[PDB]
Every structure is written in structure tokens, then in C-alpha cells.
């Protein structure tokens, strides 16, 4: 009896797969035949074959889903900052205070190369920098670390250690990742959407 | 009755105030912010209230554009509005020299009356609104994004920025509930501010056609 | 620290070490790492030995006792529910019938 | 005697059945209505219902009631929710592009042959997809010159 | 004589490793017989395929 | 000058294809190949040396265009 | 099987082969092993240059 | 309810005579005048569920 019930369940699964294959095949054909015309133009506007505009900017932001590192966010700032700290640990430079970190971030962001970057990404970078500066301030307040750089136990400077070289590397890496995460013009956006929905 | 009906009338009046304020017509903040108690003070019962005349509005003038330009709001008492009522309203608008009017029907408009309202006159603009639609403000709904009608200069700037033509913009039907809410004509452009998942906003544009 | 598994070495999602290599140092480093893994792991696995036997799936005495007790308790509770529904009133869960 | 019990005395005639769903949030247990009906405007207009925050599954009803942008948002949310229910994730940009394509002409157009005919213009693609003979004969009758864009 | 183990990573997905000596000693040796048929028919005219 | 300064993957693919097709058809080589009998490898070497004599003509949808040198663009 | 779906959108091609696959971990992820018999059949037209 | 003619067995309808409401048969002169109250209750099913859930 148990064997018969198990076989019933197995045959249910098999017939489910059998019907699903054909149904999704037809849906895939319809979706691709409808969506294949669209293309991401060089003015960042998705246009149909006839020239009509479907979107003024793809995805509202213009970022590639294939290079989408986070959970529908271009970067995971914590991971990037940790990787920058580990790759370039500068042992000959002092750590930065909250005010120093904010000042150097504001100085770097106002350069020309960051102007072409989208304002939302700059706001997110500012928010993350403010959060990490608050973390640094909380740690130094907890352990009584002085921003003068003369606290006797130097190991206390290893708690939340950030240096201007690391800040510059992190900002340049984030800007480069954002620039390289944009839709390359001419990409077959519609076919990608059709396949990524049908599969 | 006499409690839900007066509540519906008050909320219809408040939605009309919000719609007129959004269209640019002159309404005082007291009209925009009217509690139910003040409406009861104006009229506290269904037989006391007169739908055809006690609620009609003619103080609606587009103060931003021209105070001389006038807008009118009608509340026909019959659930279905016939040809004769439309004729009476049109001749009254002729008497007071008013070209823009809204008609808040109670249940519906007869197809002959609808067709007549379509071809009353290009000069006499009248818009049919069901009370059921006006019981809730469309703009206040969370799904509906922010719509702003753009001027001709802004439309020209938008077309010049993308090297575009008018017909290439995404379309929006004239009979759309938002379009009828703002009373936009064919050829006008509406900027839509979609709220993004992040703190940013996505700006798009639609052409009425 | 830690041990490699599907969550970090599999094709599931991000946090994959190969994905990190691809996103940080380009495609060539990721491909070379994949080739090195595919050449190294089989050698160690074959030299170590990894087998599955019938005794790898046989049950212990504690499992047998626990299964017997659980089956008895569950069957008793099911019989109690059957008797409650058949003869008398069974507490009806919201949104559904007694059956 | 056949239909006197079958006359409606109260409620929306299109609405079949509404249930009191409860959210059991630790902060507070809040009550919502799940309506298995097909009249969004009537439900929104009813007293005591916060019509500002009422959604629906039928994209056509949402479109006809609250505009094409509300229809687009409903399409996006419904597709994403359906995909999430099976545990598989799709980047929101794909579904957003699909919704924008479905609602770029001011009307929610399906991916069927009718909506595809209303969207696309090239004769050859319409013929290749479905109804080859009818599309080809209509194009010949209209003398429609088709580009190769 | 099957031994269940992972070997050389050449049996990743449902693949299996065979022993060269076993195949050399006749394990799995198989024969395939195919048919080739022809017809020599006499036609309506008194002439025939030859 | 308004488009992306990065050279897209489609641009790389087409530039490499055209350069390899030209090289296979007895076009002059600018990087002094070292025993490379494959035209595509020679084209990739030219791209790495930034010596490809090809100018991309990026077309805007309205009809406007702009020219970018391969050496002028940024490669990854 | 019409012209549009069977002969226009998707059509058969030459210079192609179809074979059963087997694993091989000693190859890089960007490489595929081709049998000698197939490679002798699938030809590439190389233009003579300097 | 459903009533049938004792004469031929066809269905009886309700009509009005010159004095009273009567059951009558459509195919024969049989009639039956109504003397007292006649009723046919049905007791339709009531909505019993309170519909609290979650
Ligand atoms: Zn009878």
C-alpha cells in the first residue's frame, strides 16, 4: 500500500513536468516574439524598433542586472570597504577620526570625475560614510581613544582603523564599479528580459 | 441614510476641493480643509441639503491663470441625467458665460446624454464624473504616482534634451482616470514621478493621445 | 576560518568565492581558480577515499525506539481526533469545515 | 419563488465573498479585507475602507480604475510576488521593462496576438508569429510598405 | 565488481569509470547485426534485373 | 562626447571581428606579431597595443552621430 | 513546419555536429574536447596571408 | 408545494373563481376552493459562519 501511494506521488510529479514543459515553451515563444525588438540606445533610452520610447532610462537607473552585485543594489558597501581595508592595509598612516573622515570624503567626492555619476549613488555613498564615521565615533567614545593620535595603547587604534589612502581607494573602486555596471548601449534588453522571465 | 449620505456628500465636496486646487483654481485653505462638523453646520440632513443647488460651485476661478476664467461644479439630483438637464446646465452656463463645468452624476449618464455632452461645443467644456469615483481621491492613492502637467516651455525643453518628437513619447489615454481628474487635453504632457525603492525618484513623461 | 561548501563554492548565489574573484580581479582569475579547483579536489578525494555503504544508512537503536514511541503517540492522537469528529463535536479550525 | 431568495439586499453585486484576514504583528493585530470580487471602485467607495491603500490582482480593473501608472505598478508587484512565491528571484529591472512595454501606449496590452498586433507594426513579424495568411492578405489589401527595422 | 567511490573526478554527474583490463578481457563486449536486403524483380516487359 | 567613455563589449566584438577579417585578407599589421598564425589573436594583440586603425561611429537615435577612436576609448 | 517557423526563423545548418558528452575535469572551463573524427570533417576556411 | 389533480393527475395551478382563490387543473373541469390558510415554508440555509481567521 505504501509503495502504491509512493508510486502515485511519483507519477504525479512526472505528469506535472510533462505538462509544464509544453506550457512554458509556448509562453517563452510568445514572450520572445514580443520583446525581441527593444534595444538600449546610446542616449540611455530604451526604444522600440519604430523609434518610440519605452523607457527614458532602463530600470529607472541604468544598471546591468548581470553585474548587479547586491540584492538589486549595485554594490555591498560593507564588503567593498572590508576588501579595500584587507587589500591595502597602510601600517604607516594614522587612523581617521569622524570629522577627518567626513572632511576627506567631502573633499574627494567634489572632484570632476564624480560629477557624471548619478546623484542617488553619491547620496548612498554619503550615507554609508556617515554610518561608518558614526561607528568610529562610538568605538572611540567607548574606549576613550583620542583623535590626537597619542593614546598609549596603540592596539586601540586597530579597533576601527581607516586611513585616507583606504578612503581614496574605496571611493575610486565604488565609482569604477558603478561606471562599469551600467548598460552597455546596443544590448538586447528585450530578449534578456524575455529569457530571464520565461526560464 | 442621513448619516452615510451626508458623509458621502462631504467627502465628495472635499475631493472636489482637492481636484480644483490641483487643477490650479482658487480655493481657500478652509475649503480644502473642511471637517464633517462644518459641513453639518452648512447642512445636517439629506432633505435639508439641496443637491442641485445648495452644493453647486461657481466661485472656481483659475487664479493662477486668469480670475476672469471661471469653472463650475454641478450636482444633478436625478441618478441618471437626461438630455433636458444637460440643456438646462448648458443654457445656465451660457447665461453666466462659463465655459468649464463638471457634472457629478449620482448613478450614471444616459448614452444619448453622454453623446450630447461629447458634442455640446468645443467652447463649452463639460466633464462627467461619477460620485463613486469622487468618493476617493485618486492622487492620494499609494499606487498612483505624482503627476504634474508641464507647460509648453517645459515640453519644448524636454523635446530638445532628447532630440525627440511629440509622437515618440509614451502615450496616456484622455479617458484615463488621472487624465480626467486633471482635465488634460490631447497634446499636453504629464511628468510622472515614480517613487523608487531607494530614496531616489524616477522621472518619466507621457503624452495625452 | 570556516569550511568550503555549496553556499560559498556552489552555483547558488553571491558570496561565492569565484564570484568575488570575478567581481574583483576579472574573468581570467576566476577561470584559473575554477580550473585549479577542478584539478585539485578530485585528486585529494580519490587519494582519501569517499564511499557510501548500506551501513551508512542503517538505523541505530535509539532511532528505532524514538520512532516507535513517536508512531504510537501520533497514532493515538490521530485516533483521538477521529473519535472526536465522528462522535461528538470537534473543535473546528477557522475558515474550514470539520472534515 | 425561484428568484425572490436570489435578490441582493446589501453589498456589491459583483463581490462574491469577503473574508476578515488578520495580521498578527507583535506590535498589533490589524484587520484587513480579502475580497474575491471584481469591482475595485465599489470596494474603494464603501464606507470604512481606506481606499487610498487598497490594491487588486486584476490588472485590467486596476488600470480602468486608477490609471495606467497604477496598472504598471500592479503588474510589477504581482509578477514579483508570483515569482517570489516559488522562491526564485528575478531582478526588478526585467519586470519593470516588461510592465513599461505592456503600458507604453496608454493601455494595458497583453502579449497575445491581439496585443502584439496593436503594439508592433512590421507586417512580416506579425505574419510569422500567428495568423500568417490573414495578416499577409490584410497587408496586401492595405498596401502597407514594411521597413526592415 | 562495482566499488562505490569517487575516483579521478571523471564520474561527476552519473558518469562511471570502467576498467581497461575488464574491457580487454571481454566485459561489455557486444555484437551489432545489421541487414542489407536487395530485390531483383521481373518487370511487366519480359526483362529482369540482373 | 556625451556617450560612455568605456568601450562596450559589442564594440570590442565588432572591432576585433573587422580587424581579424582585414588581417586575414592581407592587411598590414601594426604590432609585429611573434609567431601568431591566428588572425584573431593578432587582432587582440593590436587592441591591447591600442594600434587598431578603426574609428567607431556611435549613432544617436535621432540621427546625430559622434566618432570615437579605439585608442580614445577605455578598454577593460 | 511552415516557411516562417521551419525555414525562416529557425533553419538547419551545415558545418555542425551532434555527439554524446562525457565529463573531463582536466580541461579549462573555456575549452571543449572535440573528437578527432569530427574535427577531420568540420572544416574552417582560412585565408592565406603573410 | 406541488399538487396534482385527483381526476387526471396533471399539475394544479392557483387561479381566482367568482368567490374565492381555487386550485384548478388545466385539462379538466376539476377545481378546489381554498377554505383555510395553506402554507409552504422552505427554511433556506442561514449564514452561520462568523468568519474570523488568522
Ligand atoms: Zn385534472
Curated annotation (Swiss-Prot), chain B:
Any coiled-coil regions, as ranges: none
PROSITE patterns: RNA_POL_H_23KD
S-S pairs: none
InterPro entries (UniProt xref): Arch_Rpo5/euc_Rpb5, RNA_pol_Rpb5_N, RNA_pol_Rpb5_N_sf, RNA_pol_subH/Rpb5_C, RNA_pol_subH/Rpb5_CS, RPB5-like_sf
Record-listed cross-link Glycyl lysine isopeptide (Lys-Gly) (interchain with G-Cter in SUMO2), residues: 80
Database matches in PANTHER family: DNA-DIRECTED RNA POLYMERASES I, II, AND III SUBUNIT RPABC1
Assembly and binders: Component of the RNA polymerase I (Pol I), RNA polymerase II (Pol II) and RNA polymerase III (Pol III) complexes consisting of at least 13, 12 and 17 subunits, respectively. Pol I complex consists of a ten-subunit catalytic core composed of POLR1A/RPA1, POLR1B/RPA2, POLR1C/RPAC1, POLR1D/RPAC2, POLR1H/RPA12, POLR2E/RPABC1, POLR2F/RPABC2, POLR2H/RPABC3, POLR2K/RPABC4 and POLR2L/RPABC5; a mobile stalk subunit POLR1F/RPA43 protruding from the core and additional subunits homologous to general transcription factors POLR1E/RPA49 and POLR1G/RPA34.
Family: Belongs to the archaeal Rpo5/eukaryotic RPB5 RNA polymerase subunit family.
UniProt cross-references to NCBIfam families, sorted A to Z: PRK09570.1
Protein name: DNA-directed RNA polymerases I, II, and III subunit RPABC1
From Swiss-Prot, chain E:
Residue ranges the record marks as coiled coil: none
Binding site for Mg(2+): 14
Domain of life: Eukaryota
Intracellular or extracellular location(s): Nucleus; Cytoplasm, Cytosol
Subunit structure: Component of the RNA polymerase III (Pol III) complex consisting of 17 subunits: a ten-subunit catalytic core composed of POLR3A/RPC1, POLR3B/RPC2, POLR1C/RPAC1, POLR1D/RPAC2, POLR3K/RPC10, POLR2E/RPABC1, POLR2F/RPABC2, POLR2H/RPABC3, POLR2K/RPABC4 and POLR2L/RPABC5; a mobile stalk composed of two subunits POLR3H/RPC8 and CRCP/RPC9, protruding from the core and functioning primarily in transcription initiation; and additional subunits homologous to general transcription factors of the RNA polymerase II machinery, POLR3C/RPC3-POLR3F/RPC6-POLR3G/RPC7 heterotrimer required for transcription initiation and POLR3D/RPC4-POLR3E/RPC5 heterodimer involved in both transcription initiation and termination.
Stated family: Belongs to the RNA polymerase beta chain family.
Disease affiliated with this protein: Leukodystrophy, hypomyelinating, 8, with or without oligodontia and/or hypogonadotropic hypogonadism: An autosomal recessive neurodegenerative disorder characterized by early childhood onset of cerebellar ataxia and mild intellectual disabilities associated with diffuse hypomyelination apparent on brain MRI. Variable features include oligodontia and/or hypogonadotropic hypogonadism.
The protein's name: DNA-directed RNA polymerase III subunit RPC2
Source species: Homo sapiens (Human)
UniProtKB/Swiss-Prot annotation, chain F:
GO annotation, biological process: transcription by RNA polymerase I; transcription by RNA polymerase II; tRNA transcription by RNA polymerase III
Superkingdom as given in the UniProt entry: Eukaryota
Any one GO molecular-function label of the UniProt entry: DNA binding
GO cellular component terms, A-Z: cytosol; fibrillar center; nucleoplasm; nucleus; RNA polymerase I complex; RNA polymerase II, core complex; RNA polymerase III complex
Main localisation: nucleus
Known outcome of mutating residue 10 to N: In a breast cancer sample; somatic mutation
Keyword field: Acetylation, DNA-directed RNA polymerase, Nucleus, Phosphoprotein, Transcription
Compartments reported by the entry: Nucleus; Nucleus, Nucleolus
Subunit structure as annotated in this protein's UniProt entry: Component of the RNA polymerase I (Pol I), RNA polymerase II (Pol II) and RNA polymerase III (Pol III) complexes consisting of at least 13, 12 and 17 subunits, respectively. Pol I complex consists of a ten-subunit catalytic core composed of POLR1A/RPA1, POLR1B/RPA2, POLR1C/RPAC1, POLR1D/RPAC2, POLR1H/RPA12, POLR2E/RPABC1, POLR2F/RPABC2, POLR2H/RPABC3, POLR2K/RPABC4 and POLR2L/RPABC5; a mobile stalk subunit POLR1F/RPA43 protruding from the core and additional subunits homologous to general transcription factors POLR1E/RPA49 and POLR1G/RPA34.
Family as reported in the entry's similarity comment: Belongs to the archaeal Rpo6/eukaryotic RPB6 RNA polymerase subunit family.
Protein name as it appears in the record: DNA-directed RNA polymerases I, II, and III subunit RPABC2
Taxonomic lineage from the root: Eukaryota, Metazoa, Chordata, Craniata, Vertebrata
Portion of the full sequence shown: 51 to 126 of 127
From Swiss-Prot, chain G:
Free-text tissue specificity from the UniProt record: Expressed in the brain, in the cortex and the white matter (at protein level).
Top-rank taxon, per record: Eukaryota
Protein localization: Nucleus; Cytoplasm, Cytosol
Signal peptide residue numbers: none
Cystines in this chain: none
Residue sites binding DNA template strand per the record: 5, 12, 18
Disease: Leukodystrophy, hypomyelinating, 7, with or without oligodontia and/or hypogonadotropic hypogonadism: An autosomal recessive neurodegenerative disorder characterized by childhood onset of progressive motor decline manifest as spasticity, ataxia, tremor, and cerebellar signs, as well as mild cognitive regression. Other features may include hypodontia or oligodontia and hypogonadotropic hypogonadism. There is considerable inter- and intrafamilial variability. Wiedemann-Rautenstrauch syndrome: An autosomal recessive, neonatal progeroid disorder characterized by intrauterine growth retardation, failure to thrive, short stature, hypotonia, variable mental impairment, and a progeroid appearance. Clinical features include apparent macrocephaly, sparse hair, prominent scalp veins, entropion, greatly widened anterior fontanelles, malar hypoplasia, and generalized lipoatrophy. Death usually occurs in early childhood but survival to third decade has been reported.
Family: Belongs to the RNA polymerase beta' chain family.
Record's protein name: DNA-directed RNA polymerase III subunit RPC1
Species per Swiss-Prot/TrEMBL record: Homo sapiens
Gene field: POLR3A
Amino acid at each position: 500500500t505504501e509503495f502504491f501511494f509512493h508510486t502515485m506521488a511519483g507519477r504525479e510529479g512526472l505528469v506535472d513536468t510533462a505538462v509544464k514543459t509544453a506550457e512554458t515553451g509556448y509562453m517563452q515563444r510568445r514572450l520572445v516574439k514580443s520583446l525581441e525588438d527593444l534595444c538600449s540606445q546610446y542616449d540611455l533610452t530604451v526604444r522600440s524598433s519604430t523609434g518610440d520610447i519605452i523607457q527614458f532610462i532602463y530600470g529607472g537607473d541604468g544598471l546591468d542586472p548581470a553585474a548587479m552585485e547586491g540584492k538589486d543594489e549595485p554594490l555591498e558597501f560593507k564588503r567593498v570597504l572590508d576588501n579595500i581595508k584587507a587589500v591595502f592595509p597602510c601600517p604607516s598612516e594614522p587612523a581617521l577620526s569622524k570629522n577627518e573622515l567626513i572632511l576627506t570624503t567631502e573633499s574627494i567626492m567634489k572632484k570632476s570625475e564624480f560629477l557624471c555619476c548619478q546623484d542617488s549613488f553619491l547620496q548612498e555613498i554619503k550615507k554609508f560614510i556617515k554610518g561608518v564615521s558614526e561607528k568610529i565615533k562610538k568605538t572611540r567614545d567607548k574606549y576613550g581613544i583620542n583623535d590626537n593620535g597619542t593614546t598609549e595603547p596603540r592596539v586601540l587604534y586597530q579597533l576601527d582603523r581607516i586611513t585616507p589612502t583606504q578612503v581614496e581607494k574605496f571611493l575610486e573602486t565604488c565609482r569604477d564599479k558603478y561606471m562599469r555596471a551600467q548598460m552597455e548601449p546596443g544590448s538586447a534588453v528585450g530578449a534578456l528580459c524575455a529569457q530571464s522571465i520565461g526560464e | 441614510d442621513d448619516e452615510e449620505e451626508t458623509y458621502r456628500l462631504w467627502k465628495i465636496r472635499k475631493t472636489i476641493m482637492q481636484l480644483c486646487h490641483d487643477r490650479g483654481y482658487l480655493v481657500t485653505q478652509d475649503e480644502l480643509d473642511q471637517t464633517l462638523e462644518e459641513f453639518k453646520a452648512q447642512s445636517g440632513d439629506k432633505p435639508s441639503e439641496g443637491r442641485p443647488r445648495r452644493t453647486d460651485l461657481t466661485v472656481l476661478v483659475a487664479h493662477n491663470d486668469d480670475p476672469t476664467d471661471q469653472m463650475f461644479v454641478f450636482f444633478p439630483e436625478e441618478p441618471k441625467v437626461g438630455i433636458k438637464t444637460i440643456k438646462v446646465y448648458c443654457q445656465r452656463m451660457q447665461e453666466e458665460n462659463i465655459t468649464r463645468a463638471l457634472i457629478v452624476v449620482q448613478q450614471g449618464m444616459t448614452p444619448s446624454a453622454k453623446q450630447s455632452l461629447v458634442d455640446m461645443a468645443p467652447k463649452y467644456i463639460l466633464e462627467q464624473f461619477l460620485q463613486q469615483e469622487l468618493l476617493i481621491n485618486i492622487t492620494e492613492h499609494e499606487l498612483v504616482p505624482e503627476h504634474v502637467v508641464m507647460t509648453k516651455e517645459e515640453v519644448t525643453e524636454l523635446l530638445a534634451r532628447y532630440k525627440l518628437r511629440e509622437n515618440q513619447l509614451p502615450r496616456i489615454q484622455a479617458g484615463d482616470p488621472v487624465a480626467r481628474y486633471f482635465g488634460i487635453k490631447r497634446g499636453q504632457v504629464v511628468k510622472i514621478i515614480r517613487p523608487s525603492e531607494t530614496a531616489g525618484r524616477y522621472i518619466t513623461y507621457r503624452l495625452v493621445q | 576560518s570556516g569550511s568550503m561548501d555549496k553556499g560559498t563554492l556552489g552555483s547558488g548565489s553571491k558570496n561565492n568565492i569565484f564570484y568575488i574573484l570575478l567581481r574583483d580581479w576579472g574573468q581570467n582569475e576566476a577561470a584559473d581558480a575554477m580550473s585549479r579547483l577542478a584539478r585539485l579536489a578530485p585528486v585529494y578525494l580519490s587519494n582519501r577515499g569517499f564511499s557510501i555503504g548500506i551501513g551508512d544508512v542503517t538505523p541505530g537503536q535509539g532511532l528505532l525506539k524514538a520512532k516507535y514511541e513517536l508512531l504510537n503517540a501520533g497514532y493515538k492522537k490521530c485516533d483521538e481526533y477521529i473519535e472526536a469528529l465522528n462522535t461528538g463535536k470537534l473543535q473546528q479550525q477557522p475558515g474550514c469545515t470539520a472534515e | 419563488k425561484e428568484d425572490l431568495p436570489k435578490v441582493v439586499v446589501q453589498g456589491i453585486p459583483e463581490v462574491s465573498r469577503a473574508v476578515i484576514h488578520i495580521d498578527e504583528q507583535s506590535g498589533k493585530e490589524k484587520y484587513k479585507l480579502l475580497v474575491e470580487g471584481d469591482n475595485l471602485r465599489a470596494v474603494m467607495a464603501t464606507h470604512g475602507v481606506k481606499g487610498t491603500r487598497t490594491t487588486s490582482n486584476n490588472t485590467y480593473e486596476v488600470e480602468k480604475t486608477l490609471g495606467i501608472e497604477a496598472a504598471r505598478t500592479t503588474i510589477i508587484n504581482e509578477i514579483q510576488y508570483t515569482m517570489v512565491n516559488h522562491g526564485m528571484s528575478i531582478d526588478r529591472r526585467h519586470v519593470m521593462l516588461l510592465s513599461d512595454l505592456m503600458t507604453y501606449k496608454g493601455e494595458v496590452l497583453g502579449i497575445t496576438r491581439f496585443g502584439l498586433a496593436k503594439m508592433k507594426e512590421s507586417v512580416l513579424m506579425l505574419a510569422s508569429f500567428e495568423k500568417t495568411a490573414d495578416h499577409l492578405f490584410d497587408a496586401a489589401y492595405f498596401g502597407q510598405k514594411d521597413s526592415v527595422c | 565488481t562495482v566499488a562505490v567511490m569517487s575516483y579521478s573526478g571523471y564520474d561527476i554527474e552519473d558518469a562511471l569509470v570502467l576498467n581497461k583490463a575488464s574491457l580487454d578481457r571481454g566485459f561489455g563486449r557486444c555484437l551489432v547485426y545489421k541487414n542489407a536486403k536487395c530485390t531483383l524483380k521481373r518487370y511487366t516487359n519480359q526483362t529482369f534485373d540482373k | 562626447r556625451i556617450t560612455t567613455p568605456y568601450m562596450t563589449k559589442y564594440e570590442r566584438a565588432r572591432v576585433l571581428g573587422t580587424r581579424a577579417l582585414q588581417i586575414a585578407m592581407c592587411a598590414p599589421v601594426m604590432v609585429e606579431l611573434e609567431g601568431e598564425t591566428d588572425p584573431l589573436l593578432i587582432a587582440m594583440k593590436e587592441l591591447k597595443a591600442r594600434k587598431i586603425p578603426i574609428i567607431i561611429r556611435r549613432y544617436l537615435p535621432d540621427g546625430s552621430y559622434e566618432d570615437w577612436g579605439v585608442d580614445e576609448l577605455i578598454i577593460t | 513546419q511552415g516557411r516562417f517557423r521551419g525555414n525562416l526563423s529557425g533553419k538547419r545548418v551545415d558545418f555542425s555536429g551532434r555527439t554524446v558528452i562525457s565529463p573531463d575535469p582536466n580541461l579549462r572551463i573555456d575549452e571543449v574536447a572535440v573528437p578527432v573524427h569530427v574535427a577531420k570533417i568540420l572544416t574552417f576556411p582560412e585565408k592565406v596571408n603573410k | 408545494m406541488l399538487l396534482f389533480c385527483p381526476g387526471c393527475g396533471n399539475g394544479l395551478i392557483v387561479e381566482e373563481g367568482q368567490r374565492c382563490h381555487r386550485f384548478a387543473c388545466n385539462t379538466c373541469p376539476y377545481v378546489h376552493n381554498i377554505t383555510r390558510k395553506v402554507t409552504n415554508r422552505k427554511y433556506p440555509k442561514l449564514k452561520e459562519v462568523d468568519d474570523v481567521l488568522g
